[PDB]
Ligand binder design. Structure first.
Ligand SMILES: C=CC1=C(C)/C(=C/C2=NC(=C3\c4[nH]c(Cc5[nH]c(C=O)c(C)c5CC)c(C)c4C(=O)[C@@H]3C(=O)OC)/[C@@H](CCC(=O)O)[C@@H]2C)NC1=O
Ligand SMILES: C=CC1=C(C)/C(=C/C2=NC(=C3\c4[nH]c(Cc5[nH]c(C=O)c(C)c5CC)c(C)c4C(=O)[C@@H]3C(=O)OC)/[C@@H](CCC(=O)O)[C@@H]2C)NC1=O
Ligand code: NA
Ligand code: NA
Lengths: 265, 271
């Protein structure tokens, strides 16, 4: 269990737990046991400059879920600075068309937040999917709400892919600053927002009893290609050239092997 | 009784940018632009009461040309609020004989508070599915530089549209900007010193890297061709039934709208 969240702050560490828990609970009926070798559920750099923990529960069949993943990456920058990442991502299989789920707190020095329900179909070709999963809900409210905060501004990634892989309502934020209020921000706004978002994913994207015969060979293969494309790109950009570094060639390869396998790539 | 290239109600700087822009297009694509065949009724029109006045300019592309058609326009309208709305724009649309990006530049001044600028090379293929399309037309270029460059200016800020559709229909490098204040004096400087160069450079990459002659002998495969067709349909469809279908009957009265919306839907090839 990576539920320890060692290096993070209590407030941050607390959000990750509530979030992860809700996930595993509201979904027990459809999630399988974590079947990762202890060698992957927890790993670090030989020299001890970086430690991490992974948690991956795959979905049962008949279930709309492909798999879920939680993790925290703690590293020590040779510049004396410490990088700490904590995330939770939900991936759906092609038996469903509904958006995925992702929340991430990223802090190298301020703090970067990523909260969103990643669309799984082209929104320009499918104007109805846009209406169904984003207009109707209130995903945009959470983004705008967080914006009002003075020490909170829009975060635009250096990667164009990242920018396009996220939905129009996705919350990509850079919260500048000074513990004190930061933790207040997390507990009073971020968490409420993050939990609300996850809420919509569960009750409207995962839970369901409508999809008879729907999603035919073509539309379905469409999804598997797009999901595959996305999953591969993101692993080649975040792992392939960032892991051999943080934990040495020995580790990465085996951890990235597991992941690429978990991701079907 | 104003012509398209007259741009009556806006300012000199804005008016000049729109003229330079449309002319560069017309001059640089002489070889493949067909002349405007819009009836007088559609080139220029207004609401019988005098509240709204508009001018349209559409040049369809010849066959063998990668161009669907280019359209230029300006809408002047006086809101029951006592305030006036002015929109000027130029869009370039490519047909299925190519996969290359489209082109758009729009200036929108609803209130006397802010001028909204929309400058982008709208993508025509899904970027997550086609990462190479993303690398070819966006990374490789310097399109994002225009966006962050213009953003440094204190008076300039991000403009996030009420419409989720609009938010997705644009490329990640698009410049969706909200330019501050009515400090006429400084506004005119920005458009003159920054927006103009930015737009002409953007239009420049469209002309020489999306449209550009060279070996245009590249045939869009059978299935890629159909996707483009479908996605272009969807986009145009949405775009018109959102901007025109809900706003025109209001601005110029049912009589004119149906006439101009009909001409537009025809040039966009929709049903
Ligand atoms: C839907 C799921 C996901 C999305 C959308 C996602 C997005 C982003 N991750 C970044 C980063 C990142 N991620 C990880 C972990 C990780 N990545 C994957 C990918 O498949 C997996 C499975 C895992 C778990 C093992 C590390 C170690 C790490 C960085 O060092 C990097 C970062 O913070 O640098 C400052 C950001 C790129 C930077 C940018 O904005 O230009 C970008 C925001 N990461 C997702 O997991
Ligand atoms: C590739 C081409 C185009 C793109 C991509 C495009 C995008 C946008 N137009 C908006 C608007 C808009 N457009 C027009 C004219 C017009 N629309 C079409 C559509 O097919 C045609 C053919 C024409 C005739 C030339 C009017 C009158 C009008 C508004 O009142 C509205 C606006 O700004 O209100 C403040 C924005 C809505 C969301 C927002 O507020 O951010 C959004 C940014 N408009 C294009 O023309
Ligand atoms: Na703010
Ligand atoms: Na600025």
């Amino acid at each position: 269990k990576f539920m320890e969240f060692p290096y993070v702050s209590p407030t941050r560490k607390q959000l990750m737990v509530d979030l992860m828990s809700t996930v595993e609970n509201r979904l027990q009926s459809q999630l399988l046991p974590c079947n990762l070798p202890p060698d992957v559920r927890n790993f670090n750099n030989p020299n001890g400059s970086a430690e991490a923990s992974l948690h991956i529960r795959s979905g049962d069949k008949s279930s709309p879920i492909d798999f879920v993943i939680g993790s925290w990456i703690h590293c020590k920058i040779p510049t004396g600075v410490s990088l700490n990442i904590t995330s939770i991502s939900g991936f759906l299989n092609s038996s469903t068309k509904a958006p995925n789920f992702v929340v991430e707190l990223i802090q190298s020095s301020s703090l970067v937040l990523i909260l969103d329900l990643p669309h799984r179909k082209d929104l320009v070709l499918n104007p109805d999917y846009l209406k169904e999963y984003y207009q109707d809900t209130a995903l945009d409210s959470h983004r705008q709400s967080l914006l009002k905060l003075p020490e909170v501004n829009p975060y635009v990634s250096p990667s164009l892919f990242v920018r396009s892989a996220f939905s129009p309502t996705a919350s990509m934020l850079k919260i500048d600053a000074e513990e004190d209020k930061l933790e207040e921000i997390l507990r009073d706004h971020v968490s409420p927002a993050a939990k609300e978002v996850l809420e919509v994913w569960l009750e409207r994207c995962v839970k369901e009893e409508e999809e008879k015969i729907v999603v035919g060979e073509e539309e379905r293969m469409e999804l598997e290609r797009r999901d595959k494309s996305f999953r591969r790109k993101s692993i080649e950009d975040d792992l392939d050239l960032q892991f051999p570094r943080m934990f040495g060639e020995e580790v990465s390869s085996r951890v990235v092997h597991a992941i690429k396998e978990a991701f079907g790539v």
